[PDB]
C-alpha cells in the first residue's frame, strides 16, 4: 500500500579509510628542510576554519584501530628519508629454518642541514568529513556524545622522540590515562598532562656533552597529579614505584630525540626514582653518530656535530609508561619507542567518515 | 508559541534530528556538495574542484537513471516489501534518525537500487513505446 521514495542530501555517513592531503603552512623559500618538504607536498592552509557543532548524536570512536596513524607514519618516514640523509646505511635484506641474511650497504653524500618541526594540518578531500570528539573526559574508546564536524584539525607537530612527549597538545580537565587494555602487561600506557613542563636541553661551548635541565618542583607536582590519577584505576591503596628502565637498545633505555639536526640521547635515571605511598635536575646527554633507525630495521652512521652552541627549549606534555605486572605493589617502568604511540596520543579524538547522501524511505506517495 | 522563521544548523547539522524534520533541509546538504607555486599549489585546488564537480555529476546521473533527474524528492512505483524491516510510519518519521535508518536498511539497499534500476525507467519505458 505504501511505496518507496528516494531522498537526496540526507545526513548519513559510513566509516571510510581514504587518504588525506596535508595542507600545512609552508613559506616556499626557507631551507628549514621541513618547509622544502612542505612546499612540495602541502597546499596552503585555510584562514577561515569550518566548525559545525552537531546535535544530540553519539558516535562510537576508536583510538587504537585508527586509520590516520598509518597515514601519519608513511608521511613522516618520507620526510625523514628526504630530509636527513645519513652517511652510512645498513639495512638487512635476507632473500629466502634454512635461511641466511646478508646486510646491504649504501654510501650517500651527507651534509648537515637545519631541522625543526613545523605545524602540520591533516585535511580530508571533498565528499569526506572529519568528526572530532569534544568530550573533556574521553576514555579513548567507546562512545562519545559531543561529536562535532571539523573541516580539518589543528597544527600537529611531528615530534620524533621516545620515552617522553615533546611540544605536544594538552588535556583540558586533568591528567588523562589512555590504554587499549589495562591488566594485559603488554600494551603501553599513554599519560597526558594538564600543564607543560619546561625543559631546556642544550650543548655548552668536550663536544660530546650536553646539560639538560628541568624544574624539580613542577616535575614533582606533575608526578603527584600522575600518581593521584593512577590510584583511581588500581584500588586507591597500592603504593607504586618508578624504576628507570630494563635493558634494551640505547634508543629506548634513555630519552632520545633530535635537536637542531643532531641526535640527543639524554638519560632519565634522575627522574623516575621516587616511590609514592598512601631546585633543578641536570641530565647527562651523550650526542651520538651510531643510531638505530625507528622507521626500518638497520643501523645508521652520521657526521660529527657542528661546533658552536646548540640550544633547544621545549615543553614536556606527556609520558609513555609500561607496567611490570607480577605478584602488593606495582612498578611503572617507562618504556615506549614504537612511534605510532607518539602520534596516536595526539590524534586520539578524530574519525574519518564518508557522506553517502542518497537514502530511500517508505511514504504514501504515488506515480 | 511565538516564532520568527527557520534557522540554519549548517552542513550535516541535522544528523541528530528526526527524519520528519531533517528531510525539510535537504537543500542545505545538497548545496554544499557542489614558478613553483603555480605548478604545485594551484593544480591541487584545480584537481579538487574537478573531482567535486565530477562526483556531483556522476551522482546526479545516477539519480537521473531512475527517472528522478533534478528533483530532490520524487516518487517511484516499487512497493515496500514487508521483509525490509517493517515499522509504523509514525515511528519511522518521528522516532528515528537517518543514521539508525541506514543502520537498519543496509543489508537490503543494493536490492532496492537494483529494483529501482530494473523497474520504473525500464518498465514505464518499453511499455509506453508499445
Amino acid at each position, epitope marked *: 500500500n505504501l511505496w518507496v521514495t528516494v531522498y537526496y542530501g540526507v545526513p548519513v555517513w559510513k566509516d571510510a579509510e581514504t587518504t588525506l592531503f596535508c595542507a600545512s603552512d609552508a613559506k616556499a623559500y626557507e631551507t628549514e628542510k621541513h618547509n622544502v618538504w612542505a612546499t612540495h607536498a602541502c597546499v596552503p592552509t585555510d584562514p577561515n576554519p569550518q566548525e559545525i*557543532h552537531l546535535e544530540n548524536v553519539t558516535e562510537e570512536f576508536n583510538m587504537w584501530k585508527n586509520n590516520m596513524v598509518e597515514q601519519m607514519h608513511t608521511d613522516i618516514i618520507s620526510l625523514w628519508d628526504q630530509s636527513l640523509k645519513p652517511c652510512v646505511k645498513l639495512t638487512p635484506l635476507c632473500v629466502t629454518r634454512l635461511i641466511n641474511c646478508n646486510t646491504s650497504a649504501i654510501t650517500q653524500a651527507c651534509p648537515k642541514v637545519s631541522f625543526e618541526p613545523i605545524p602540520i594540518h591533516y585535511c580530508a578531500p571533498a565528499g569526506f568529513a572529519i568528526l572530532k570528539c569534544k568530550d573533556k573526559k574521553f576514555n579513548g574508546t567507546g562512545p562519545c556524545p*559531543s561529536v562535532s564536524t571539523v573541516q580539518c584539525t589543528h597544527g600537529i607537530k611531528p615530534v620524533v622522540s621516545t620515552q617522553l612527549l615533546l611540544n605536544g597538545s594538552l588535556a583540558e580537565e586533568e591528567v588523562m590515562i589512555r590504554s587499549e587494555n589495562i591488566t594485559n602487561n603488554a600494551k603501553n600506557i599513554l599519560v597526558q598532562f594538564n600543564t607543560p613542563v619546561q625543559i631546556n636541553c642544550t650543548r655548552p661551548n668536550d663536544i660530546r656533552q650536553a646539560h639538560c635541565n628541568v624544574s624539580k618542583a613542577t616535575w614533582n607536582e606533575t608526578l603527584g597529579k600522575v600518581v593521584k590519577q593512577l590510584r583511581k584505576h588500581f584500588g586507591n591503596n597500592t603504593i607504586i614505584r618508578f624504576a628507570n628502565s630494563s635493558g634494551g637498545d640505547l634508543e629506548v633505555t634513555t630519552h632520545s630525540f633530535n635537536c637542531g639536526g643532531e641526535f640527543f640521547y639524554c638519560n632519565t635515571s634522575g627522574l623516575f626514582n621516587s616511590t609514592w605511598i598512601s631546585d633543578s635536575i641536570t641530565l647527562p646527554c651523550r650526542i651520538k653518530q651510531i643510531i638505530n633507525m625507528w622507521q626500518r630495521i638497520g643501523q645508521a652512521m652520521y657526521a660529527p656535530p657542528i661546533q658552536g652552541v646548540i640550544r633547544c627549549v621545549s615543553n614536556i606534555t606527556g609520558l609513555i609508561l609500561t607496567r611490570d605486572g607480577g605478584s602488593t605493589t606495582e612498578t611503572f617502568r617507562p618504556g615506549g619507542g614504537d612511534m605510532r604511540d607518539n602520534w596516536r596520543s595526539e590524534l586520539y579524538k578524530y574519525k574519518v567518515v564518508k557522506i553517502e547522501p542518497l537514502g530511500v524511505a517508505p511514504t504514501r506517495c504515488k506515480r | *508559541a*511565538v*516564532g*520568527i*522563521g527557520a*534557522v*540554519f*544548523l549548517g552542513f550535516l547539522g541535522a544528523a541528530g534530528s528526526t527524519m520528519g524534520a531533517a528531510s525539510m533541509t535537504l537543500t542545505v546538504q545538497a548545496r554544499n556538495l557542489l614558478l613553483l607555486k603555480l605548478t604545485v599549489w594551484g593544480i591541487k585546488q584545480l584537481q579538487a574542484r574537478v573531482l567535486a564537480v565530477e562526483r556531483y555529476l556522476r551522482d546526479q546521473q545516477l539519480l537521473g537513471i531512475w527517472g528522478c533527474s533534478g528533483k530532490l524528492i520524487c516518487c517511484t512505483n516499487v512497493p515496500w516489501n514487508s521483509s525490509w524491516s517493517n515499522r509504523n510510519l509514525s515511528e519511522i518519521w518521528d522516532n528515528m534518525t537517518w543514521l539508525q535508518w541506514d543502520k537498519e536498511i543496509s543489508n537490503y539497499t543494493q536490492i532496492i537500487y537494483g529494483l529501482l534500476e530494473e523497474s520504473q525507467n525500464q518498465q514505464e519505458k518499453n511499455e509506453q513505446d508499445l
Partner: antibody
Amino acid sequence: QEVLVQSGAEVKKPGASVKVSCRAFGYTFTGNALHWVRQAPGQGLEWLGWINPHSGDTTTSQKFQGRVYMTRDKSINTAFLDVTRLTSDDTGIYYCARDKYYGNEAVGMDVWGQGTSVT
Amino acid sequence: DIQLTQSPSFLSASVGDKVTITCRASQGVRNELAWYQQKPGKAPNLLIYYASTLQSGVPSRFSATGSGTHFTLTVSSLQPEDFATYFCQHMSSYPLTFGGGTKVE
C-alpha cells in the same frame, strides 16, 4: 560546554547610549534564537527582545520600540544590543540567553551569560 | 499584557519537606510556561520546560504539573543546595514576562 562570553561592566551617564556584546561558544550560533533580559536589583525578571542570528530580524516589546536595537555578526558570532536615552531605571545587570528552540518556537532559556552591569 | 502571580511569595521550610508552589496566569496559555531558579549573585538556571518535562541534568526529585491558568511545581525533598528563587514565565503571546519572585528558606 556551551557558554556565552560578554564584555565587562559599564558605567554611563543619563541620556547616552550603552553597547553590550554576547559571543557564543560550544554551539552553532545561527541555530537557536537569542533573548536579551535585564534585572534591576530587588525586582523580578522583565524582558527586552529576541533575535534570530540567521535572518537578523528583531522583536521588542510594546514599550521599547525605538529604544533598543539588536544586531548580529556571524563572522565573530557576536550579538550587539544598544540602549538609547539611558535613565535611572535602566541601571542593572544584563543577560543574554540562548533559547532551546524546539519546533521553531520559543521553549526555554538554558544557556546564560554572567551579566553586564550598567549604571 | 498577561499577568503572572506566584503563590505564596516568601516561604520557610526545613530539610526534606514536601513543597508545592503555584503560578497563576491572567489568560489561558495551554502549557506554554516554564520554571526557572536563580541563586543570589548568579544567573538563572532552567529546570522545567513545557510545564511537565525535566531538563537534562536536573535531579529527578523535582516535578511540575498544571493546566490552563493554574500551574505548580513540587519538590519532594528539600536540600541545602535547593534554596534559591523560583520564577515562572509564559511564551504563548507577547510580552514575555516573569513571576514576581519566590524566595524559599
